[PDB]
Structure 1
Amino acid sequence: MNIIAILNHMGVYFKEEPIRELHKALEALDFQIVYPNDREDLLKLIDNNARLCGVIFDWDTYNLDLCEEISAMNEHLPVYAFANTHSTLDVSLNDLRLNVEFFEYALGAAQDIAQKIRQSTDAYIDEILPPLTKALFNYVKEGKYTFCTPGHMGGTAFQKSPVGSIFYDFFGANAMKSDISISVGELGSLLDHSGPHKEAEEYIARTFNAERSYMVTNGTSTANKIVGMYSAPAGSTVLIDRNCHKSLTHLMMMSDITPIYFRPTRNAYGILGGIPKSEFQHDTIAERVAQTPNATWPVHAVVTNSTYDGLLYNTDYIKEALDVKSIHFDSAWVPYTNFSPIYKGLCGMSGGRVEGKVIYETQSTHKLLAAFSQASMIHVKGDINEETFNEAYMMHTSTSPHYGIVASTETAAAMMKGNAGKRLINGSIERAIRFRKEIKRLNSESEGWFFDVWQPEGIDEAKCWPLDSKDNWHGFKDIDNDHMYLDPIKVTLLTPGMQKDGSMADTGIPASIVSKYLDEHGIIVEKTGPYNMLFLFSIGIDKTKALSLLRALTDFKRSYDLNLRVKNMLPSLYREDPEFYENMRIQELAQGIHALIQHHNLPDLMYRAFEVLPTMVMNPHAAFQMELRGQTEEVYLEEMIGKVNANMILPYPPGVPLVMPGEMLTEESRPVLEFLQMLCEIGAHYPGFETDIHGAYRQADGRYTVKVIK
């Protein structure tokens, strides 16, 4: 934060000479000076360089409308106007609202003006930094000696070791110096919500539109467990989105809570849809309660919003219609919903208090904002017993939190404020929409096959596009209207191989091949389904990366159409079993995988296996407890029918839990088993494309076993 832009070349010595002296004095104060040629140049510099901490210009040449243009980009950026002919009578109230400091031209005044500019820069830095992060940085500047944990003592231990010194050089001194503990009393305590931490929490709650907020240093998995434990005592009944992250299943294995499942939808691609509106109704829930043994009226409900693939619920209807006192929106994938009006009504914290209810949002700050991994947030709107919640919170948080992760959470909040933060979010959305339109254009002008994008036909303006029953782009049958919306940030590209009616074509390109090719060429996809690839167009994606992705996709298409050899196209895959992949070409491998998928009818089996719910014989807690008592046996996959499962079976694809612990496959649930059996067969043909079934175990002979209650 040390770049100062000087805008003029004035042609009079009485201005130029003081400006040259000021240049020298500022450089003595450790500033880097840049010289834009004109106002458009300056505005571009500001747009492209966030380290620009100040602008100097001549008030005679440029009016204060230049300050208005600067402030529209960054309302806190200090601007220094040098006055010669203008006086106090030439400024208006609106002008005086801007962060402008006025100086005059004089020989010998460079030193005090530079001192004033240094003070203003420090004030700018202080204004944009959040309280905890500022306190941490100031403590580091103090350079105190520690005889307390952590044992590396501000990085000293690393410097005394060869390999430690390599680690220290990689991560840098500041990262080590800022790794501290609650022995440093001036920073307060996260667990006690004291000092700067308290301020941070309030800061976050204000930025994220929450009544209360909590920083979590072990991910949204831990955040979910905190919320669930506070909300669902033992013996209670909980409504669970069947498209729940396995953290919720872990919570159920930990606490003796009886689940009743919301049933979401799916399309032919295996992309998860939303829970239909009828599942939120009182009568449906009551009937399910009546049929479920040891079930009562639910005290807590958990809904995944958004889905992994970017489908958001209209949350106003859910908050109105779900007759449960506590509603928890697992919003891991959408921590940005408060920072753009296009998400209004599509997030848990949207709007005000719901009478008689408490709404939680759990957000993964590290997933789609800028924070270190494991940084997570809990947002609460509604009445809670603060002390009991604090107990549930401390039960899952370490007594030695990583201060860097905490500071990054606060800093993500700070990055979201003001004109600069609005530009960040809006720019990310606009970039995603431009990329989507470009994919559509390239697909249109492609002579043969090209990548498609999963979206409505005519996207024009930045918004969350509704899923409507008439349109068939989304592939969901008989979907409720004004219910599901697509987040433009989450871009799903489709490889050829599936027809528009839900069947698969004669030829196809499985998306795993494309993801491997992209990895070989320096591009990492978020995830890959059978014929879809997910790309996150977050605030960390710039034009360079998007254009590079387009170039990589066209390169893959050209290489595939030339039918290159796997040894050349995919060398790392070839290094897996070089004997198998000799003289094997790309089109043959792709067609073999596609024909294996088709012959086994993978889409129909995947769809049917997730449409029938396996029978719940005991809650996951009881089954897990019996597994802890060593009362389970490993049996083969063909014998699952009638056996109570001890473990969650989570297959990829589609990447969502298929069997929960305590559930039993009956005859009416046989397709589940068939699907799994199928995943075994297809997984045993091409190295590098192995089966991936959590909860199943590959034996030495190549068969698969599962653990069941003995």
Structure 2
Amino acid sequence: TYFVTNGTSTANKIVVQALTRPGDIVLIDRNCHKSHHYGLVLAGAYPMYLDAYPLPQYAIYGAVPLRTIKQALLDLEAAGQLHRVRMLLLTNCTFDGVVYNPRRVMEEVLAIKPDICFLWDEAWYAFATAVPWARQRTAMIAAERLEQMLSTAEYAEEYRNWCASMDGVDRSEWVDHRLLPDPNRARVRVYATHSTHKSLSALRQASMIHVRDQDFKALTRDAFGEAFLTHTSTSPNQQLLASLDLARRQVDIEGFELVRHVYNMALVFRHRVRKDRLISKWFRILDESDLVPDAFRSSTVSSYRQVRQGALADWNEAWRSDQFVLDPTRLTLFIGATGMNGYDFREKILMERFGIQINKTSINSVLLIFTIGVTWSSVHYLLDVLRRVAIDLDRSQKAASGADLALHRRHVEEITQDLPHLPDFSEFDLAFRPDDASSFGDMRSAFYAGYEEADREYVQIGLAGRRLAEGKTLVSTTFVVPYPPGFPVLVPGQLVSKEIIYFLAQLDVKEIHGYNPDLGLSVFTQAALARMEAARNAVATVGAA
């Protein structure tokens, strides 16, 4: 552990620079916070974007299924490119609150690429110290358990029997099998970068780069220190920051009381929002049955008849063994029954800043982030707000009898019953793909090539569809980061596939980052793309002449 004074994105830039050099491929969860993509522009690495499983009924994105990661690695393996792959950047505890199972992810990824490094952005997973079984899903504990496992002889026997079980299966088919990391080759090179409690507060100061690296002392110590000083300062006291604080920093004992208080407040809120029948009539709190498709979990509520309430901890195996679970301190609230949009609800109904937060407003839901300021007063206030909303909705239902029942039904069906498509990642343009078969992009070159004011042009969203049908393909020159998704839907050099233009065309918000409806979507001119493709062909020739 190393204390970084300058926030989480600085820690990410430090570790990315310590681990990656230009032209390395990194696998990156596409929906991660935009600051991760700029770091890959800066490092000059090529992203291979992994696309999360969609939840269109909420217009939410989940995590990246581990089969997606295995397929994406084996695609490059068939291309012969896999040697390039240097990193697997994933965000643990994604903003939506889906939580990865890092132990299995590392096991199966290290089955394919025995020397990959893992970076986990854990800035959202702050309260895992409170929750009794959440700690094991932290990267730094999963890496410990995996390194212990890789050490034992019993595991060497288990792997012997596993590779005997797989014997005669093609490497291409390992996407369909449960893999184990070869204890001879796999090496645990895990990194995690979590925000401090002070940073959790709206002012952002400080972070910590946790390290569980087998090959730090040999391969990366120098690069890591160099990048540390590069991204902070080259002044006295930076070296002191470079000093470790792993067996130190026990001051959290006072902190532990606070994180456990916050967790107990989250439990109280969940139980009083589920029991209270005024609130429960309309409001709901999504759980693993709603936000995680059944394909990614073995725990099924209906299949075991001796059911238990579940307020109590009768589901300890889910944490240990499922792919995806929800962080209990990041509570999604479903307002679909009410009929109000999430943005409308957050902005008007409550405006609650005393404790808790609503960082994200979904089309039919509002996410509730329990911070370190929450108190009994704050949760009782929020519950009272919910209760008053429910009472006035019941009043409107009573009035609804006189021809307003159809308006309530219309609002509810429109927000919940009817949903738009979620646009998954297109592909990089040929101009910016170094290998014509693979999907990783030269996104840095597209970023810089996008500033050539003679190579860019503007197209209106109403014309883009016909331009695409005309074969005048569209390639974006810049990032585009709409507010509701909160992540880049387009990146430099990405093809604006029909689904993505259809997505952008719906947005009323004019102040989208990277795009402007009054000017148009910035795209490469056709001649510029032809020139870029010719340059790529020249490179692919001289590199093999």
The match for 1:343 is 134
Match of 1:235, SS state, is coil
1:483 aligns with 2:296: no
Q: 1:453, 1:494 within 8 Å by CA — same for their partners in 2?
A: yes
Could you tell me which of 601, 614, 636 is aligned with 2:460?
A: 636
Contact 2:329 2:369 in 1 (8 A): yes
**Is 1:622 aligned with 2:445?**
yes
Q: CA deviation at 1:370?
A: 6.4
1:67 aligned partner: none
5+ long unaligned stretches in structure 2: 148-185, 291-295, 303-319, 398-403, 433-441, 529-545
CA contact (8 A) 1:335 1:368 kept: no
Report if aligned partners of 1:232, 1:257 keep a CA contact under 8 Å in 2. Answer: yes
**TM-score computed with the length of structure 1 as normaliser:** 0.53
In structure 2, what is the equivalent of residue 431 of structure 1? 265
Matches within 5 A, 1:323-402: 323=113, 324-338=115-129, 340-351=131-142, 352=144, 354=147, 356-366=187-197, 372-382=203-213, 383-384=215-216, 385-398=220-233
Equivalent residue number for residue 86 of structure 2 = 299
Q: What is the correspondence of 1:192-341 to structure 2 with a 5 Å cutoff?
A: 213-267=1-55, 268-281=57-70, 284-288=72-76, 290=78, 296-322=83-109, 323=113, 324-338=115-129, 340-341=131-132
CA separation in 1, counterparts of 2:395 and 2:380? 23
Report the counterpart of residue 517 of structure 2 in structure 1.
698
* Contact 2:130/2:263, CA 8 A, preserved across alignment: no
State the distance in 1 between where 2:482 and 2:492 align.
14
The CA distance in 1 between the partners of 2:279 and 2:140, in whole Å, is 43
Structure 1 distance, partners of 2:491, 2:362, is 22
Report if the CA contact (8 A) 2:25-2:47 is conserved. yes
Equivalent positions of 1:382-531 (< 5 A) are 382=213, 383-384=215-216, 385-398=220-233, 417-418=252-253, 420-442=254-276, 444-445=277-278, 449-455=281-287, 468=298, 470=300, 482-497=322-337, 508-520=339-351, 525-531=358-364
C-alpha distance in 2 between matches for 1:522 and 1:277: 37
SS in 1 for 2:139: coil
Q: Matched residues in 1 for 2:427 and 2:301: separation?
A: 32
Query: Measured at CA, do residues 542 and 402 of structure 1 come closer, stay the same or move farther in structure 2, by a change above 3 Å?
Result: farther
605, 613, 617: which one pairs with 2:426?
A: 613
Following TM superposition, by how much is the alpha carbon of 1:289 offset from its aligned partner in structure 2, in angstroms? 5.2
2:484 aligned to which of 649, 653, 656? 653
Q: Which amino acid aligns with 2:503?
A: F
1:510–1:369 distance in 2 versus 1, CA, 3 Å: closer
* Matched-pair contact (CA < 8 Å) for 1:338–1:350: no
State yes or no: 1:549 paired with 2:376.
no
Alignment check: 8 A CA contact 1:333 1:367 kept:
no
Is the 2:278–2:390 Cα contact (8 Å) retained in structure 1?
no
Distance (Å, rounded) in 1 between the aligned partners of 2:387 and 2:322: 36
Cα RMSD for the two superposed structures: 3.8
Amino acid at match of 1:256: G
- Once the two structures are TM-superposed, the CA of residue 361 in structure 1 deviates from its matched residue by 0.3
> Secondary structure of 1:557's partner?
helix
Deviations 1:450-483 (A, max 9, x none): 211112589xxxxxxx9557469xxxxxxx9711
Q: Does the 8 Å contact 1:237/1:296 carry over to 2? A: no
**Aligned residue runs from structure 1 range 115-154, under 5 A:** none
Describe the shift of the 1:521–1:317 C-alpha distance in structure 2 as closer, same or farther (beyond 3 A): closer
Q: Once the 2 structures are TM-superposed, how far is the Cα of residue 652 of structure 1 from its aligned partner? A: 3.0
Amino acid at match of 2:268: R
Retained in 2: the 8 A contact 1:645–1:664?
yes
Q: Is 1:533–2:363 an aligned residue pair?
A: no
| Alpha-carbon separation, structure 1, partners of 2:446 and 2:192 | 29
2:90 partner letter: V
- CA-CA distance at 1:659 after TM superposition: 1.7
Give the secondary structure class of the aligned counterpart of 1:514. helix
The TM-score normalised by the length of structure 2 is 0.68
Deviations 1:145-179 (A, max 9, x none): xxxxxxxxxxxxxxxxxxxxxxxxxxxxxxxxxxx
Structure 1 contact 236–296 (Cα < 8 Å) conserved = no
For residues 367 and 589 of structure 1, the distance between their equivalents in structure 2, rounded to whole angstroms, comes to: 46
Q: Are residues 529 and 278 of structure 1, via their aligned partners in 2, closer, same or farther at CA, if it must alter by over 3 Å?
A: same
Q: Distance in 2 between matches of 1:415 and 1:381?
A: 19
Q: Deviations over 1:120-150 (max 9, x none)?
A: xxxxxxxxxxxxxxxxxxxxxxxxxxxxxxx
Helix, strand or coil: the match of 1:653? coil
Quote how far apart the aligned CAs of 1:704 are. Answer: 4.1
Provide closer, same or farther for how the CA distance between residues 487 and 367 of structure 1 changes in structure 2, counting only shifts above 3 A.
Answer: farther
Unpaired runs of at least 5, structure 1: 1-212, 459-465, 473-479, 498-506, 565-585, 684-689
Letter of the structure 2 residue corresponding to residue 329 of structure 1: W
Q: Is 1:671–2:499 an aligned residue pair? A: yes
Q: Distance in 2 between matches of 1:350 and 1:435?
A: 29
| Aligned residue-pair number | 423
Q: In the alignment, which residue of structure 2 is the partner of 1:111? A: none
After superposition, the C-alpha distances for 1:62-81 in whole angstroms (9 at most, x for unaligned) are xxxxxxxxxxxxxxxxxxxx
What code does the residue aligned with 2:138 have? Answer: C
The code of the aligned residue for 1:275 comes to V
1:659-682 CA distance string (max 9 Å, x none): 2211113xxx31121111122xxx
CA contact (8 A) 2:12 2:193 kept: yes
Asked whether the 8 Å contact 2:25–2:48 carries over to 1, the reply is: yes
| Cα distance between partner residues in 2 of 1:457 and 1:257 | 37
- Partner secondary structure for residue 663 of structure 1: coil
* Alpha-carbon distance in structure 2 between the residues aligned to 1:512 and 1:587: 23
The alpha-carbon distance between structure 1 residues 592 and 695, as it changes in their structure 2 partners (threshold 3 A), is: farther
Residue identity matched to 2:287: Q
Q: How far apart, CA to CA, are the structure 2 residues paired with 1:644 and 1:544? A: 51
| CA deviation string 1:351-400 (max 9, x = no partner) | 52746231110112247756951322211111322221111122222568
Report 1 or 2 for greater relative contact order, CA contacts < 8 Å, sequence distance ≥ 6: 2
